[PDB]
Design a protein around this ligand. Sequence first.
Ligand SMILES: O=C(O)C1=C[C@@H](OP(=O)(O)O)[C@@H](O)[C@H](O)C1
Ligand SMILES: O=C(O)C[NH2+]CP(=O)(O)O
Length: 436
Amino acid sequence: AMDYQTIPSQGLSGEICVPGDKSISHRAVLLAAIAEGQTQVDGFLMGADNLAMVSALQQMGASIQVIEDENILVVEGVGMTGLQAPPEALDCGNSGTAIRLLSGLLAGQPFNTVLTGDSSLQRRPMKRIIDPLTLMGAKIDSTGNVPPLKIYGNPRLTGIHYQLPMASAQVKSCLLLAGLYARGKTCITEPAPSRDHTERLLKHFHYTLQKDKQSICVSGGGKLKANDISIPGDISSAAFFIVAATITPGSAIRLCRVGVNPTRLGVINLLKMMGADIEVTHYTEKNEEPTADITVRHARLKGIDIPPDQVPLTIDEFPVLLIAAAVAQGKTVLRDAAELRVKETDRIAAMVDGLQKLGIAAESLPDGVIIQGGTLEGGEVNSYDDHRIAMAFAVAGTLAKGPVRIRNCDNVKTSFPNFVELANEVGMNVKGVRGR
Ligand SMILES: O=C(O)C1=C[C@@H](OP(=O)(O)O)[C@@H](O)[C@H](O)C1
Ligand SMILES: O=C(O)C[NH2+]CP(=O)(O)O
């Protein structure tokens, strides 16, 4: 039982390299596992969520050498049909991405699999993948449309045309993966574009994608071919520092080699709309993902009305963006973000609770929040076991008038194992301490 304790910052400074992208890491190892040939993955995120994906794949006979101290995986692919029936349930930990992408991969295998997870994951919604996989011919049992899931593999799935009913890159990805195993074309239409890492990695692994009028499509029966991958820094991890440097007087930092995929840039798009001073330089493209260095200096902010097209491009950054909104001049309004309620925790409820506890006038909406910019006070908040709520309030502590105690931070290692170390290195004071 560990908590974080902060004291205000006198200014962030320095150059830091954040760890690898969680979303790209999940996809890289999964596709590499079923490719033909050897894939070396550099920059792999050695956090709990990504290592749960690795262990699950190893239980099914993927050949993965984990070099944790170097953030490298060496994967010897087993080909499309090379996986083997696992002996026990696959424990996905806290990871919705893992359970949802694995379900797509496993729906068309000739064996049965049970997928489970931690107490948070077992409360999260799965009807969104069960419905369309079932249309493809899958058989997935669940009690109450939440995990645990039992997948009765069907090696004769059929492609479908599906329009996403919510802006979910996970549903899109799940269906594209099942599409690799399905007879014919699987075409996905996205009315609200979400992160496109699956599409980019499929191309990297030489799997062809086609696009028509309104959708992206894959045809089953192709072969993934091994191709070394360098994973960019996670912009979601960098976002904590981007906000901290933006709001803390005297700050100027540079974040090196961060992924800057346009479908992941919402936090920068929105902060610039608020008045932030953010420069993206040294742009490079590798393995179909763009990377760049991001330089951030303190700037005074104004409240904004957040547009809906940016919600799927900023979904995981709302916790830390709301901290920026809390110290901006004026009102910030977030609507059409009901997806926040079905994450590791209900992130709207969690952010509103913590902000009120730190003296901010924050109000919940069914699909968002309304925040009146003000002044953060010291106090005590609860992470609700959500890594991003925890890190968001650690960022709040940079500008809070007094110390901030953040309860229950043991899940920060699901996405950012060295958060505390890097935070202290740049000037945002954080101590890991024993809780109650
Ligand atoms: O596909 C992915 O890697 C992710 C998609 C998002 O979830 P949804 O697909 O539920 O929006 C995001 O919240 C998650 O952390 C990573
Ligand atoms: O990383 C985050 O902020 C949200 N993760 C959602 P999950 O991968 O567990 O579905």
